[PDB]
Amino acid sequence: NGNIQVGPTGQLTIQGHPVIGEGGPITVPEGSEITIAADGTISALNPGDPPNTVAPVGRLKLVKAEGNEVQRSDDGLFRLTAEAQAERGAVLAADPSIRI
Amino acid sequence: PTGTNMQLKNVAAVMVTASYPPFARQGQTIDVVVSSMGNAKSLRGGTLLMTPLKGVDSQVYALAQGNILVGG
C-alpha cells in the first residue's frame, strides 16, 4: 500500500503504521509538500519558500523479497518466514536496485 | 562569493546567556545557556563555536565554546 498520509506532527504513516526509513521511522517537517523519488528519496518543500530550498529529509526503506520468503501475519502485514529469517536476518537489508 | 546560494542544514544561529559571578577572575569557567533564534528544529548534539559574551556595556567578559547538552 503506497497511500502514504502525513500527520499534523509531520510523521509518515501507512494505515496508522509509521513508515520506516534509513534513520528509522520517517518524520517529515510539519506542513510541507513531499516528493518521493524513484529511489524513495523524500524531498520536503516549505510553502511560500522559493523552490531553491527543496532539501531531502530521508529515504524510504525499500526491500526485495519473493513470495517464498514472506508469510502473512494476522494484521495484514507480511513478515519473513523462519527459514528466510535465518537466511537473510531478522531485519532485511534495503536493495538499491528497487525502483519506486 | 557575495552572490551565491548557501542552504545549510547543520548550522543554527543561537543566543548564549550566562551569569558573571561575584569576584570572577580571568581563566575561570562558568555555565552558559544556548537558545535557538530562528526556525531551527533541534540542537541535540551541536557544538557552540567561539562566542564572545558581552555585558551591558557591550564589552567582552567571557568567551564561550563547548558541547551542548539537550535533555532528550
Next chain:
Amino acid sequence: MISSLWIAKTGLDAQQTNMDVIANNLANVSTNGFKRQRAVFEDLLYQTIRQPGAQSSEQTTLPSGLQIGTGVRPVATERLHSQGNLSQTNNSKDVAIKGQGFFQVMLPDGTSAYTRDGSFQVDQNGQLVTAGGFQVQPAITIPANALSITIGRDGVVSVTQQGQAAPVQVGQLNLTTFMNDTGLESIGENLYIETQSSGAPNESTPGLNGAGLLYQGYVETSNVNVAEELVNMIQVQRAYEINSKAVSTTDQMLQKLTQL
C-alpha cells in the same frame, strides 16, 4: 466538470474581451482627444502535481517536472498616450495640445476632473466650458462685447474689445501633468480622474518643464490606427474559432464517456 472545458472557456472570455476592446477603440474614431486602449493577458496559476527540482533519485533531480496550467485572464487595459494627429477646424475656441498636458474641469459635485479634448464653448454667463457644460479651470471669464479671443502658445487668453488697440487679458490656461498618465480612471465623457496609481496633479504653464503647447483653431483627433484594428479583428476571430473548436472537441470526448 472537466478541466479542459474551463481552460477553453477562459480563453473564449479573454478573446471576447479583446474583441470588446477593439470595438470600443473603433467606435471612438471621431472622438477628439481619445486614446486607444490595448489589453494585456496573463496565464492563471499552475497545478503543481510533481514539484520540479525534486530528487528524481538519490543522486539525480527531476528536470522541469509535471506542471498543468489553467486558462488565461486579462491583467489590464493600458492606454496609448501619444499625440493624436491635429486638425484645423478654424474656430477661435477650439484648443489642441501638442505635448503631454491636460485641461482641468470641475464636475457639478465639486471635484476636479481632467480632459484632453479642447472643444470649448461659452455659457450664458461668459465662462469657458466644455461640450458637456463643465466649467474649465482656471475659470476664464469672457466678457459680453468680445470681438476676438486669442489663446497663445503659453496659455494666455486675451480679448480684444472695440476701439482699444491693446488686448485685455481675462485668464491663464494651465495644464496638469501626472507622473503616471495611464493610471487615470476614465469616467467616460472624455474625462479622467486622479487615482493613487496616477501620482498627483502637477499644475504647470503650457510651454514650461513639460506641459504641451496650446494651439488655437486645432483639435486633437483620436490616435486609433484602423488597419491595425482590422488585422487584430482577423486575429481575434481566428482565435475565437480555435477556442470554440477546443470546447467542441471536449464536448465530443465527454460524449463517449457518457456512452461507455
Next chain:
Amino acid sequence: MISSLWIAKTGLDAQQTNMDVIANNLANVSTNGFKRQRAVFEDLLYQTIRQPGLQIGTGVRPVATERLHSQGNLSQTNNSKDVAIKGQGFFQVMLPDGTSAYTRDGSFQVDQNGQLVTAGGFQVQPAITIPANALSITIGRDGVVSVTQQGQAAPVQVGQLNLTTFMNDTGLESIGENLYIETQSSGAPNESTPGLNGAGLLYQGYVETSNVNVAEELVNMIQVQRAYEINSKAVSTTDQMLQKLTQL
C-alpha cells in the same frame, strides 16, 4: 479487480493531461513572452512472468512538461516603455514578499513615484527611477535607460537593465502571473549586462509574443480526441468481458 480497467484508465488520464496542456497553450496565445508546454509520457512499471520471459505492462503516466524556450516573434506597441529580448535572458522583478522572480513579458509602466514596474505592479530590478519632467525615455540595446529633459541637450543616465541568465532555462518554476522563480534544476542566476556573456539584446518599442504554434495544437487535439475514444472503447470491452464472467 485484476484486469485492464486500470491500464485503460491510466491511458485516458494521459490523454486528459495532454488535452489540458494543449488548452493551456491555446488560451495563452495572446500573452506576451509565453513559452508553449509539451507533456512527456513514459510508461509505468512492468510485471514479469517467469517460465518453467514475458512482461505485461501497466499503463502510461505523465512525467514532466517541458517549456520550449525559443525566441518568439516581436510585435509593435509604439510604447516607449516596452522592451523585448533578442536572445536568451530574463528580466528580474521583485515580488512584494521579497523574493525575486524572473519574467520575459516586456510590457512595463512607470508607477506613481517614478519606478519601472511590470503590468502587475511589481517593481523591476535593477530599480529605475524615472524623473517626473521626462520628455522621452530611451532604452538602449545594452540596457542603458537614458532620460531626456527639456532644456538640457544631453540625455541623463538613470539605470541599467540587467538580464538574468540561467544555464537551464526549462527548470524554472512557473509561479503563475508570467513569472518564474529559480529552482534547484535552474540554479545560479547569472546577472549580466545585455549583450555580453551570452545575454540577449533589447529592442525598445517591441514586445515578445507567445511561442505557441497553432497547427501542432489542432492536430494534437485531433489525436487526443481519437486516442481518448480508443481508450474508452477498451474500457467498454473490459466491462463487457467482466459482465460475461460474473453471469456464470
Next chain:
Amino acid sequence: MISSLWIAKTGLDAQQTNMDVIANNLANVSTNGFKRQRAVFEDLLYQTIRQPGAQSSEQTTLPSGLQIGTGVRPVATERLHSQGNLSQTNNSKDVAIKGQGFFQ
C-alpha cells in the same frame, strides 16, 4: 497566433509608416526651409531552427541552415538635409542660406 500573420502585420505597419512619411512630405511642399524625411528599415529577429554552419557530422558541415526570419522594423526616419531651390521674394527681411548653417 501564426508567425506568418505577425510577419505580415509588421510589414503592414512598415508600409503604413512609408505612406505616412510620403504624405507628410507632400503636405509640406510650399513651406520654406523644409527637409523631407526618409524611413530606413532593417531585418527583425531570425529564428535559428537549424544553425547555419552546424557540425552535422565529424566531416560534413551543414551550409546555410534553417534561418526562419520574423518581420521588418523601421530603423529610423532621417531628414535629408540638402539645399533647396532659392526663390526671390524681393523683400529686405528675407534671407536664405547657401551652405549648411543654421539660424539661432
Next chain:
Amino acid sequence: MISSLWIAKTGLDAQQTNMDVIANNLANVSTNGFKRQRAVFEDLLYQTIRQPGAQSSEQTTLPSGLQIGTGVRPVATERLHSQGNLSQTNNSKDVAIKGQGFFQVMLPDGTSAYTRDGSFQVDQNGQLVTAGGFQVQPAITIPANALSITIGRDGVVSVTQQGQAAPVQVGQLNLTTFMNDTGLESIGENLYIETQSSGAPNESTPGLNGAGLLYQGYVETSNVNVAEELVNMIQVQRAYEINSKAVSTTDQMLQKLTQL
C-alpha cells in the same frame, strides 16, 4: 497516433515554413541590401518492410519492396545573393555595391559583422557609422568643417576643405568577400556574422580580386520579385488545404474505426 496523421503533420508545418519564408521576403521589400530566401525540402524516413533486392524463389530477386516513407523536413533556407536594382537618392553618404563585396562593421562587443546596406551616417565625433549606430571599419573619420564628401568607386574617401582646392584623402573603404556568401549567419539589422561554412573574411579594395565597385548616391534595393511571391502564395495555400484534407480523411477513418 496514426502514421498518415504524422506524415500530414510534417506537410502542414513545412508548407507553413514556406509561408514564413514568403512573408519574410515580403516584409523586407523596402529594405535596402536585402536578399530573398528560398527553402529546400527533403524526404523523411522510409520504413524498410520488404527489402528491395532480397532473393525470393532462390534465383529471382524482389524489385522495389515496401519502402513506406514518413513525411517531409526542410533541409535549409538559402539566400539568393544576386545584384539588386540600384536606386538613386542623390546623397553623399549612400554607397551602393555593384559586385560581390561586403562592408565590415565592428560590433561594440568586440567582434565584427558584415553588412551590404550602404546608408551611412556621421556620429558626433565624425566617424562613419551605420544607421544603427555601429562604427564601420577600417574607420573613416570625417573632419569637422567638411564641405563635400566624395567616395570614389575605388573606395577612397576625400573631403573638400575651405581654402584648399585639392581634396584630402581621409580613409579607404574596403570590401570583404567570402568563399561562400550563403553561409553567413544573419543576425538582423542587415548584419551577417561569419560562420565556419562561409570560410574566412577576405579583405579587398573595390575593383580587384572580385570585390565590386562602389557607387555614391545609390542604394542597393532588395531583389525580392513580388509576382513570384504571389504565385507562391497561391501554391502555399493550395498545398496546405490539400494536406488539411488528408488530415480530415485520416480523422474520418479513425472515427469510424472507433465507433464501429
